[PDB]
Swiss-Prot record:
GO molecular function: calcium channel activity; calcium, potassium:sodium antiporter activity
Lineage, top ranks: Archaea, Methanobacteriati, Methanobacteriota, Methanomada group, Methanococci
Membrane topology, from the record: Multi-pass membrane protein
Protein name: Uncharacterized membrane protein MJ0091
Main location, first listed in the record: membrane
Transmembrane segment boundaries: 3-23, 39-59, 77-97, 106-126, 128-148, 156-176, 192-212, 220-240, 247-267
């Protein structure tokens, strides 16, 4: 019970570690095959793939009459993606954002602000429909502005990507499941702590994938994965959750996300996303997890 919890924990870490690199390699190759930028492949394929945990979690939680957990997971992931994921990544591999990608980030900021405004009185299923539709439009807009029998180079690329994705998604589950089995076996299980860590567990793909891309100096891919995941977490995870049940307002967390998203845009536009910007993101994330209400909603 405690040993197989350790077994799942270690195997999950191994799958997350190597799986992320394969997912990054396959995605980088796919981008070159389709003549799209690393940002675009990160903001679409990689972002949605790594956000599959959030979507399922939010859908399931809301369906089970826990809409607090549903939006808690969605928004908490967004704060984690900028604060922790991008924070660590920018320090590892500083990013100077090109003028084209700056417009994408601006559209991201508008989306976030829009979601924050309509969410002041919580999120209804109609709010969900609109956000999902904007999500779809964002994806098509992003691909268009980043664009332009079967080859063994292409095949091997798709194998890498898919197996890499399977690795990080399964790896994240073994890690979470393993940790829960340990805590249960040691009788230190805490539901409030567990639900507080929900967003982090589903964020393990983004974290490991972005660090792997950061190590290979793929800053466009990193930035794409962060921006795209947040949009997927709002226009997808949050949205689907609201389809099952009205989600309660999280005005403080939305306010935190808006500030972080604004900072991200300002750095991208007028500066860079490097060491000291990354330090600030991490510091704000640390302050966030130190002061925000626990229970994950
Ligand atoms: C042009 C979109 C680009 C990508 C997003 C950038 C940020 C957009 C945020 C607000 C503007 C749009 C408000 C209208 C959104 C689309 C239509 C819609 O959702 O129609 C459903 C109807 O509003 C149910 O009452
Ligand atoms: C394919 C998606 C499989 C999604 C499992 C989602 C889930 O329930 O969350 C667990 C873990 O965070 C997932 O990485
Ligand atoms: C080349 C551009 C490809 C854009 C694909 C957008 C949708 C990705 C869905 C991934 C689902 C996993
Ligand atoms: C219900 C709210 C209707 C008005 C929504 C206003 C959003 C303002 C910021 C829009 C950014 C695009
Ligand atoms: C025309 C080029 C872009 C195609 C983009 C297809 C995007 C499909 C996105 C599906 C998202 C489903 C989210 C469910 C929560
Ligand atoms: C970033 C704006 C989020 C929505 C703010 C709406 C007006 C205030 C509503 C009461 C908010 C209490 C928490 C304030 C941070
Ligand atoms: C705690 C140390 C925080 C340091 C923040 C530096 C921000 C630099 C922005 C440029
Ligand atoms: C390549 C590494 C360069 C030096 C990186 C220093 C990182 C400092 C991170 C500080 C995070 C916030 C701490 C708040 C107390
Ligand atoms: C001030 C010096 C310490 C800054 C970092 C830790 C968090 C301080 C704010 C939150 C305090 C607990 C709020 C519930
Ligand atoms: C140095 C820290 C400066 C910020 C201190 C913030 C205290 C925040 C209390 C937040 C309570 C949030 C409840 C949802
Ligand atoms: Cl709840
Ligand atoms: Cl790149
Ligand atoms: Na994601
Ligand atoms: Na609303
Ligand atoms: Na998450
Ligand atoms: Na995720």
């Amino acid at each position: 019970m405690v040993i197989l919890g350790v077994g799942y924990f270690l195997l999950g870490l191994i799958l997350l570690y190597y799986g992320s690199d394969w997912f990054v390699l396959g995605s980088e190759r796919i981008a070159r095959h389709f003549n799209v930028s690393n940002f675009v492949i990160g903001a679409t394929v990689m972002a949605i793939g790594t956000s599959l945990p959030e979507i399922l979690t939010s859908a399931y939680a809301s369906y089970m009459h826990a809409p607090g957990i549903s939006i808690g997971n969605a928004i908490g992931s967004c704060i984690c993606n900028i604060g922790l994921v991008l924070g660590l990544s920018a320090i590892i591999s500083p990013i100077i954002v090109d003028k084209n990608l700056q417009k994408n980030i601006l559209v991201y900021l508008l989306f976030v602000i829009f979601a924050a405004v309509i969410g002041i009185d919580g999120f209804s299923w109609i709010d969900g429909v609109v956000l999902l539709i904007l999500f779809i439009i964002y994806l098509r807009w992003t691909v268009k502005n980043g664009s332009a029998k079967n080859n063994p180079s292409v095949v091997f690329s798709l194998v890498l990507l898919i197996i890499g994705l399977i690795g990080v998604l399964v790896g994240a589950e073994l890690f979470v499941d393993g940790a829960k089995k340990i805590a249960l076996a040691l009788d230190i299980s805490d539901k409030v702590i567990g639900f507080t860590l929900v967003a982090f567990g589903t964020s393990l793909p983004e974290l490991m994938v972005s660090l792997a891309a950061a190590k290979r100096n793929l800053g466009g891919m990193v930035l794409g994965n962060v921006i795209g995941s947040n949009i997927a977490d709002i226009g997808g995870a949050l949205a689907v959750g609201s389809l099952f049940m009205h989600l309660p307002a999280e005005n403080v967390q939305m306010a935190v996300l808006v500030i972080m998203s604004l900072l991200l845009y300002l750095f991208a536009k007028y500066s860079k996303i490097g060491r000291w910007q990354g330090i600030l993101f991490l510091a704000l994330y640390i302050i966030a997890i130190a002061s925000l209400r626990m229970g994950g909603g």
